[PDB]
Design a protein around this ligand. Structure first.
Ligand SMILES: O=C(O)Cc1ccc(O)cc1
Length: 770
């Protein structure tokens, strides 16, 4: 009854893109890839199954059967093998169809073409090589709502004004002449897509008996008759217009961490249009935002199980930034449309649309108090981002102050302006696992193979300054060997799986006539980066290296140490308790909280002088998504009392696990001692108990503590979740029951049933605060 009604995961495998792209490549054979793609995608949207759900007033969906996740063979296809039905993956009996597409799309798929290119193929855990040929790229926020007040028609004109009055093909990239035609070809695709619903919604009208539900869709057909093609005019046809731009991208590439930030900023002129004109009510607007959280869900993920350890089983980042600052004037933009957004998170309790708030000095204290109740209930949501510091990072990249003020976020914590960055290609490297390799000697304990460089013998280091060069020499190897892989993989993805439709919403892409992935990016700045996930464990161990190994303590010699972790404290269980009691990050120890700052300052030195993509340099994104588990489980033992095969850390500057013997103010004062201005978004989450946040103390102690954390300490991002540790243990022993539990992990909340085991038991260990 609570306004909205989401439903169940009674889903099966769907072949409405794979089979529809397969015969698109065959019917449009010979046309260049830029055109053979664009011609096939409009074939999809104009021909794919369509339906309108019940009591919903949004039409376009992310699949051809309710919640059945589509499959894209353009990116990969040879991962569907022998089981016929068996593990969250299921089909009816059509396995002979997947093997038919896999037979066709063999050696012509993204990874399928990619894995030949190399030659030898080094399977890895120190870098996500498996997640770079298999995972779809997005993690941006294009201007599909900042550049959709023009409409698809206004786009096709600029393309037509381009192919005619500026072409003169003097090899002005035949690739560019074909990109232009392609971009039109699926711009009419998003027209046919919404003109199919108009004919179907109008058909769903006469046979309808409820006259209010009849007029509900009779206006939707009138919306979709003008929403995608021409510029929108009303709040009901501005949302549907923006959404169809999110789908046209999804039909060309399963847009991963695509952000849709600032819906409280660009749906306002129509919001302020219909309301003050009595055309739409606040509850009606709260209906669409409710119907927006539901319809966005169907985009489930469908990747091989070999990555579920590192990417969970349903890690979706559909973030939207509510609140903020008016760019042209500097005042606050926190408005009622932001109030209805987190009002929607009440009546519908979906965990994917992140719904993030952006704090700033003169923000609206009322709609920030009301934001603290949204995380006071279930779900660890409105991930408060602090501006002021993030602005300095964007302004020092090159963006103008208006572009910087107007920033949103893409994916987890990546903050960036809308239509400028271009489909990021990330790199994971557990800089605690590097410590394992150099404390060894490039041996990769879990693998027991001399796969690294013999930088130096630990039993012959002599001094700490000698170690940190043997740690630099080892880290730099996995730099020019990891970047060098997905650098020329973004370039290689020009023979397969480029993002043509997404270029409709990247600046200068239309002008230079080149896609955002390869070339026509307006800013090749924050477009490639690294995620160190567990660098707290670097500082905690570096402290043990700096303090209490070299100089004093020869009993805990370099020999007694390496063997203790070799056997994982077995026979040394007395020692680990002392190291686990040594000063650890998360409290308020400058002697231990400053080494994690120098830690990032050690990573920011090597990678920032490494060129990237088409220009600029690699960034450093300390965030995480689930890569602490799949990497830590293969990262064997650490000096700071760690056990062998356990996770790294909970991302960026979050305290390790049970290391905060001090209150919440310390856990942020520590995390504040990080010069996080040049850090591409920090993932900082911590757990409170519901007795603290569900009272005035939540909107009094926290606010005074989170505002102080960002203004005095220069933080960037803070995200909370309230849930008892027993409630998670009670979910571990009853996982058949709590299959719809909202648990935060790392910049998102996902159902506990699709969460990995190593992530569950790790979430038990996170401390409780008051
Ligand atoms: O988000 C990540 O860090 C992993 C990733 C790698 C490649 C890709 O295409 C998508 C995601």
């Amino acid at each position: 009854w609570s306004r909205l009604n989401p439903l169940r995961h009674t889903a099966k495998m769907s072949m409405a893109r794979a089979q529809l792209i397969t015969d698109g490549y065959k019917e449009y054979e010979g046309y260049s890839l830029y055109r053979k793609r664009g011609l096939s995608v409009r074939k999809i949207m104009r021909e794919i199954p369509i339906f309108i759900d019940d009591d919903q007033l949004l039409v376009g969906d992310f699949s051809a059967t309710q919640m059945s996740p589509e499959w894209y063979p353009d990116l990969a296809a040879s991962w569907v093998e022998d089981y016929i039905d068996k593990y969250e993956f299921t089909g009816p009996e059509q396995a002979e169809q997947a093997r038919a597409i896999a037979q066709y799309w063999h050696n012509i798929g993204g990874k399928e073409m990619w894995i030949k290119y190399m030659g030898p193929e080094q399977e890895e855990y120190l870098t996500n090589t498996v997640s770079e040929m298999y995972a779809e790229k997005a993690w941006n926020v294009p201007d599909c709502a900042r550049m959709i007040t023009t409409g698809a028609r206004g786009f096709i004109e600029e393309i037509d004004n381009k192919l005619a009055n500026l072409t003169v093909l003097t090899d002005e990239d035949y690739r560019a002449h074909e990109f232009y035609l392609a971009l039109r070809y699926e711009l009419e695709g998003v027209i046919d897509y919404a003109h199919r619903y108009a004919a179907l919604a109008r058909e769903k009208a006469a046979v309808e008996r409820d006259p209010q539900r009849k007029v509900e869709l009779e206006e939707i057909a009138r919306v979709c008759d003008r929403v995608p093609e021409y510029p929108a005019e009303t709040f009901q046809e501005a949302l549907q217009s923006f959404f169809f731009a999110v789908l046209m991208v999804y039909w060309d590439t399963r847009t991963y961490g695509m952000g849709m930030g600032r819906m409280d900023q660009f749906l306002y002129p129509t919001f302020k249009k219909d309301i003050e004109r009595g055309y739409i009510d606040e509850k009606y607007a709260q209906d669409l935002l409710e119907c927006f959280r539901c319809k966005i869900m169907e985009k489930r993920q469908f990747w091989p199980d070999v990555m579920v350890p590192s990417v969970s089983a349903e890690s979706h980042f559909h973030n939207v930034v509510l609140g903020g600052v008016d760019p042209k004037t500097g005042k606050d933009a926190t408005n009622r449309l932001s109030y209805l957004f987190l009002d929607a998170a009440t009546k519908v309790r979906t965990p994917h649309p992140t719904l993030s708030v952006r704090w700033h000095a003169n923000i609206d204290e009322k709609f920030m108090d009301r934001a603290l109740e949204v995380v006071a209930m279930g779900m660890g949501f409105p991930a408060f981002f602090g501006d002021d510091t993030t602005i300095q990072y964007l302004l020092e990249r090159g963006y103008t102050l208006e572009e910087a003020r107007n920033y949103a976020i893409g994916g987890c914590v990546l903050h960036q302006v809308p239509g400028k960055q271009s489909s990021v290609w990330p790199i994971v490297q557990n800089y605690g696992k590097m410590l394992e390799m150099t404390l060894n000697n490039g041996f990769n304990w879990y693998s027991q193979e001399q796969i690294g460089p013999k930088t130096g013998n630990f039993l012959e280091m002599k001094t700490y300054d000698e170690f940190i060069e043997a740690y630099r020499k080892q880290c730099e190897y996995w730099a020019q060997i990891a970047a060098n892989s997905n650098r020329q993989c973004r370039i290689e993805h020009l023979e397969s799986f480029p993002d043509i439709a997404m270029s409709c919403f990247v600046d200068d892409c239309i002008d230079r006539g080149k896609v955002c992935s390869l070339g026509g990016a307006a800013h090749n700045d924050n477009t490639q980066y690294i995620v160190p996930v567990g660098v707290q464990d670097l500082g905690n161990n570096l402290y043990v290296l700096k303090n209490q190994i070299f100089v004093d303590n020869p009993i805990c010699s370099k020999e007694t140490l390496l063997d203790a972790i070799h056997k994982n404290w077995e026979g040394y269980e007395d020692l680990q308790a002392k190291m686990i009691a040594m000063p650890k990050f998360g409290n308020d120890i400058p002697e231990v909280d400053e080494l994690v700052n120098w830690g990032y300052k050690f990573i920011e030195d090597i990678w920032f002088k490494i060129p990237s993509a088409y220009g600029s340099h690699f960034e450093v994104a300390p965030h995480s998504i689930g890569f602490h588990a799949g990497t830590g489980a293969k990262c064997s033992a650490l000096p700071d009392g760690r056990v062998a095969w356990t996770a790294m850390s909970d991302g960026a500057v979050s305290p390790r696990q049970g290391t905060d013997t001090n209150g919440p103010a310390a856990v942020m004062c520590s995390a504040g001692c990080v010069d996080q201005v040049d850090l591409f978004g920090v993932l900082f989450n911590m757990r409170f108990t519901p007795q603290s946040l569900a009272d005035k103390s939540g909107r009094d102690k926290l606010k005074a503590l989170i505002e102080t954390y960002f203004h005095d300490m220069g933080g960037k991002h803070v995200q909370f979740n309230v849930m008892s540790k027993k409630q998670m243990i009670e979910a571990k022993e009853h996982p058949l029951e709590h299959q719809d539990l909202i648990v935060r992990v790392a910049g998102y909340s996902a159902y506990w049933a699709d969460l990995s085991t190593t992530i569950q038991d790790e979430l038990i260990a996170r401390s409780e605060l008051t």
